[PDB]
Amino acid sequence: KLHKEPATLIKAIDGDVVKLMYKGQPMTFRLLLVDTPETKHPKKGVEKYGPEASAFTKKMVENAKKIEVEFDKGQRTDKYGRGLAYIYADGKMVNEALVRQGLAKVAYVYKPNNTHEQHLRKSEAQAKKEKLNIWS
């Protein structure tokens, strides 16, 4: 099964990207299975709720006692060289917290990197029902 490993925050970059020190190496991580509105959108720039999603991720990781990363069962890096992972701040998955708050959508899913897909989809359905942020 999947396992958590320790990492150290270097810098939060956007809602869905964080730079971490991982096994003694600075690395950029892209959060698995979620799309947040972005502040650094290639074509668009700052989308609606982009600053909000980005402040949420930042606070969560900056204020944590512990950060852990959890790789899935498939490829662990994307074509930009970013680590592909679930990120935990004090035992709470950042990927799910964004989706539960209506600050991210569940992304298009690529097996076999889909271990937490069902759980995220449940939180997404709940944030839509509660009409939170993006779903308002």
Swiss-Prot record:
Residues 116-132 have a biased composition (Basic and acidic residues). Residues 116-136 are annotated as: Disordered. Ca(2+) binds at D16, D35, T36. The active site is at R30, E38, R82. It is found in: Secreted. This is Nuclease A. The chain holds residues 88 to 223 of 231 of the full protein.
